Amino acid sequence: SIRSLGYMGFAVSDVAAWRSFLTQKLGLMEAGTTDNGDLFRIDSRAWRIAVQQGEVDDLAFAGYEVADAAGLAQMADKLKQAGIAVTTGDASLARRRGVTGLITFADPFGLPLEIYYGASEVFEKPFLPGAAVSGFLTGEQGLGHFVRCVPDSDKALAFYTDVLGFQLSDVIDMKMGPDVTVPAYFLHCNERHHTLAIAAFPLPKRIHHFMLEVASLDDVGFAFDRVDADGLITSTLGRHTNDHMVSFYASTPSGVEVEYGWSARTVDRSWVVVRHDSPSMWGHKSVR
Amino acid sequence: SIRSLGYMGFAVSDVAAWRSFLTQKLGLMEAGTTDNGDLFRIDSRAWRIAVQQGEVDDLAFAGYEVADAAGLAQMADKLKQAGIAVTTGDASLARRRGVTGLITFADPFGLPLEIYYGASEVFEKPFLPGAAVSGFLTGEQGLGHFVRCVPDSDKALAFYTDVLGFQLSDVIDMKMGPDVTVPAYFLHCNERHHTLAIAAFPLPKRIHHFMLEVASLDDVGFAFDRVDADGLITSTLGRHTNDHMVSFYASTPSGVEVEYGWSARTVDRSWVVVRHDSPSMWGHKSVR
């Protein structure tokens, strides 16, 4: 059973721009370079985000974490039984990722996915942010979330819920012009309101954005100014209707956006699926 | 599995009187008019109470909420297996109710019931009461409760417990004159002491009253004076023996009564069924 989103890798055209963006603007910690690419940290894990040179300028792969080897075995079986082509990552890949075991495959629309267990911790190299950030919220909630753009939401849903086991949190009917309303589906696999959202948006990228959650309002406020100085803000500060996260959006060097937020509410046993007609209570004025 | 009472609809002869009563006396928020009728809010949901023009001057339908589509499917099966005629609400009805999916049917004595999932939230339109009320208590406890008057309590019980899944909280043997004692059964489907009560009272209505719970004693005290000014109080302030709610009762424009209370105790895993001979510890002096 998937416990959380553990890591993500980006294939970008300008690695230097990304390095500077992630550390100086967002405050991530530079963790060195390896055959896994330029590594970045936000907590005790050896790395959470990897940046590799590439032409797509998009998310290259995402890794989902299971608790142990038994969990890995369950998932591999679930995928096989579903007719998905799964590959047991070899020792070489596992060493490159810094994990104990992993299986690889792709989602229905070609996004490379990895499910692994036993990632590396580096408590002996205490996290020191590249900019003034009090802390990032990970723990049992994992890395954060990302919005997967797909040509067919229903096909994507069946795969993520029935095969991968994500559960629906809620749906937002996004009005994109008078003759267009696109439902966005928010899915959770732990307490975090959503670790994955699915929507059929007309974008050239695999994801609309990825999100990182910080510990205080000031972390968000200071980061906003740092990003704003370079004219990279895409949405003003606002609060979402569904997860109640206070956040802003900005452009990364690849065009893909990043959401930087604070104070999201979690999902619990009493949770019930609901629908919304707006993605924000207040703010989030688009300045794109 | 039913999680809570989600909404109620009334068919009344004087819609204007109801509108004024609900907002100015009870403090509900007027949420507009649609083909679903005049809508009223008490929390983040798009509506909780609907008022439609009608001759019965009574509860027209009640909607029970399940967590998701799987829950809806379970309930539909449970009802079918019980031999109840169930109808999958069409897109038209679902849109009118502002829900994602719903099934319709009736209780053994003709009360139209609906079980649905995926209701609409409107966090972007913050709740503002029509009168000074600090807040209403809903959340996982749902809307509140109502007392269903029936000609046969045993038949009603078998349906609500065996088919709908409500659990018994307790029983109160209500003394209505020397040669008459009527047992009232209190049922729960979540933490709220009771979401439904059943009693064979000789009333022309489907329900004796519906109840709304507020956040503070002052909310109740101020509302009492507002209602008292128009001579609509039916029972003075008092506290119930079973749910320990402090409340008063008043007449709505349809003759059906409304209970307005505060500070009820909840049901938990350690709960055991008990019986009482009185419905009130103190107060609740009838002034009908």
Place this chain on the structure above:
Amino acid sequence: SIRSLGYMGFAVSDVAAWRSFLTQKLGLMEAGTTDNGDLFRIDSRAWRIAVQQGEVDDLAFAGYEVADAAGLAQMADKLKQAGIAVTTGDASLARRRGVTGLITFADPFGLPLEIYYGASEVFEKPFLPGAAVSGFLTGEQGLGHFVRCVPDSDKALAFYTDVLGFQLSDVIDMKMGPDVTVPAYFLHCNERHHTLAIAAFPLPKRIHHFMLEVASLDDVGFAFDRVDADGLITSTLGRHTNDHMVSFYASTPSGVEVEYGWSARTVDRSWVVVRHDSPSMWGHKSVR
């Protein structure tokens, strides 16, 4: 410096009616009979209320407590310097009151007052109420309060503030008919919002009422029903605008009223004098 109202004595025509009223209706503990009269307890003190046979059917004396002998000395001096006739109570009176030392005198309009120190505690005879009452609130706030009716409020004020040291909490302009508005002054000598109130009401008694504060809302609710059964309620349940006490009023056998309340707010260092035009937020409907 006066720390609190410590005890009160009533001279009544029907001692038996009072005994029954105080214990069975209000829940005080019967503490025996002495040359000080029938004694009643509400806490650890040997007695707080004394009932003696008398024709006035009114408050006979009130005792204010100082911390020690030095405090008693200060007060005696303050009174002498003000030209008030003060008498050092003899050993006989002190023994009758169960106190260590006391001085006697009268207010400007003839109410016998006593200031004392070193009252008797009886922790070895645990308080057991005459009716179901969870507890009375005394402690550093003393016995409670009473409203002193006077022919001249200004003269009364100068005496109670300048000579006795009480401080003003607030004022309520009580509308008694179109051509009559009477200001009621509320005074404190400790945290209790008011230990004494002064008003020029046209009543035959020295006080309008005395007040006792209980620990829970149920104490008030149950007591209301007990009193209501005998038709003695004078005001329905309500909450005051100034002290925020939730209470009801009832008639004692002497015509003097008693207020029984719960949840009053206290006075602190940040307190500022204010004025009100109403004595109640809600309730307190007169049924006299």
Place this chain on the structure above:
Amino acid sequence: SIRSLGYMGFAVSDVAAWRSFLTQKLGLMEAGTTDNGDLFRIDSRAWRIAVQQGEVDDLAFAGYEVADAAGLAQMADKLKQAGIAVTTGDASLARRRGVTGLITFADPFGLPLEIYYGASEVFEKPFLPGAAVSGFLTGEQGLGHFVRCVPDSDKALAFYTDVLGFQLSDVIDMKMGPDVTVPAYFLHCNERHHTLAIAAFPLPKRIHHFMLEVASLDDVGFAFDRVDADGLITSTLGRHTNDHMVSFYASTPSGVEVEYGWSARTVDRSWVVVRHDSPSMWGHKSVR
């Protein structure tokens, strides 16, 4: 599944002595007389202890509480399957006990037992103790506990654990003289450390003692003095090794003893069975 010990009935030769003992010494509330005998209360339940005239001067019956009718049904089946003669109490017995439904039977050595559901609550008649007691601890822990004397502990154990479902807490090897060591078994059916203890002691009675738990140390201290005044103390104040209860023991008018205690520790999921060689850490000096 048995949730707790709900009530007990005693058949005694001197009902008046018992009435006075329970109210004046222990502080129970006298709840009237019925065909169920003299009734006594310690909480919201209509009665917990019944005293009937009888020659045995011992426990006459004990009632164990289940949560509902389904629970009653389960227990009846469990007993039947075990070959125990069970009788469904008739409406007459149920009305006498003030319960909704009950089954009767006897333990292996003739103690009449009853399992019931739906007892009567009397919140409208607030508990008022017969002596100064802050409160008794019942709730989900039930009435308290009693020690059942049996000729064969192993046979008794098999019945109480395998048939009735009690679980072992711990065992104390009680040294009764050089050539005699008797194991006492402590059993729980809820959080209370033990609701029942079994030991093969050479006593003429069915039980060694019953225990009532109070809310504060002073409740115990004051009760000790009240009992001591009549020379009824059998063990000085002490604390048990297993439940950590601070208590004293005294003789009731029937010779059966009563334990009056405070501050016992509870049993939880992490609990493991252990053994002790002493029943007390300190105190509990026998003065029999």
Place this chain on the structure above:
Amino acid sequence: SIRSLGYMGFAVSDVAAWRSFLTQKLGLMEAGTTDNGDLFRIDSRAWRIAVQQGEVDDLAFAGYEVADAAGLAQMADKLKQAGIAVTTGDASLARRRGVTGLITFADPFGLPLEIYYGASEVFEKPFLPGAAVSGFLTGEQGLGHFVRCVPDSDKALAFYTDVLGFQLSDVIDMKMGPDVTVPAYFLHCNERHHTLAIAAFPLPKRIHHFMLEVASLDDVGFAFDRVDADGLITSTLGRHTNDHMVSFYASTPSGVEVEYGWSARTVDRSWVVVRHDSPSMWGHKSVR
């Protein structure tokens, strides 16, 4: 200004008996022998109790602690102005006591007293009790208290309050036979209810007893059994009416008694002087 009772010294005929009594029965820590005598600890201070060989078998001296050198200077002046013969302790005495500075004198009836500042701490030699005791309560409340027997209470009072600065807490009128009532005065110099009590009892000793306060009820219970084993208990467990301390009394090898207690209430700014007719709520049965 005196902050607390800091240390005490006893001159006894059997030093070995005292050593064994203090460590094995009461749980004090043996801190070595010096020219100050056998030293005992109860906290971080180098010593709190000193035992020297002597014929009086009584308290030999008591030391009161001031905050600093200025405080010492104030006290010396206060005493001189009162006409008391004060001696500035020489370096030899100060070194023997392990203090920075001290003055010596005697109370009106010959008890040698010392006021000092700058006592020695020994945090590097962690306190380890001689018996199982969770801890002693000292801190800002100092060592504990003792009852000074005097031939004239009034003369003693004037000295302790007017000259030494102690404040009265309360008075207990101790009934010693029909024709004898002796008032006992309880004085405080900090939060501890009383650090000194004065009474004109007919005893051969300078003090009736000294008291040590422990951290838990078990400390008291276990100590009671240890002392009881040697037949040294003088009063059973009980709770005082004035300080609400739960304690027992026992005989030391010198005849002087020791009180060992727990859970006393403190004195605060709202405190008022009161009187009692009994020294105990419950217990404290004399077995002398």
Place this chain on the structure above:
Amino acid sequence: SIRSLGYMGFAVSDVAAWRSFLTQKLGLMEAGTTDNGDLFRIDSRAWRIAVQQGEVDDLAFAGYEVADAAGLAQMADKLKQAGIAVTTGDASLARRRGVTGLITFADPFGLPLEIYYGASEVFEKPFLPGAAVSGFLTGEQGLGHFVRCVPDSDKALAFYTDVLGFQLSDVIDMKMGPDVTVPAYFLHCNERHHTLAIAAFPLPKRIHHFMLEVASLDDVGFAFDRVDADGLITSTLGRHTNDHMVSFYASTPSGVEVEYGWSARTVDRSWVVVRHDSPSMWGHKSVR
């Protein structure tokens, strides 16, 4: 199901050196000598560590605790089904261990193991440490942990996880020289991060060390100095990367080391297996 490590026994060449080491350096309580050897306590249990005369100078046996007789039965079956030779300990062995029932067997590499239930508590003999220690942390976490040295980690793992039921917490790849990296596996059976660790180290002993956890940082600091005085420290103070325990290591008289720590983090339901490349965040400098 194994609940915790309950006790351990050592067979040593110098019993006197061990006695002195455990009490004076580590602060354990000497609990007497029996046919079970010299017994030592750290909490309410009659003994936790036994020292017997022997030539191996190593761990002689370890006892794992189950909750009851049913648990013992389950384990015996699990072992039999695995083909392990299990022996039901006779009454003689059970009495020697002070337990109710036990089974004996050996791990794959000859370490004698015992699984038991119903150990002896001695609350009547309060724990008093041999040195100043505020307390040891046991409870539901049991005794502590030990590192089992084995020639084949994989064979050891299969036995401890598949047969005994321990669960993996994490793995640390211990670098022992350039051409050697040894994985150490940490296993838990309750909240304690690990009760057992397995590693293929080249040591002559069955275990590398055993660990005892204390209640405060000062307990560790003071113990460090006591041990350091005799030159027995093997690792300076440091904090582990996996359990976050702050500790030091020292040599026992048998060469086997002991870890003395404080403040370890626990394992919960959200726990996921991870890997580390270092066993310490800071400190733990080897001075061997």
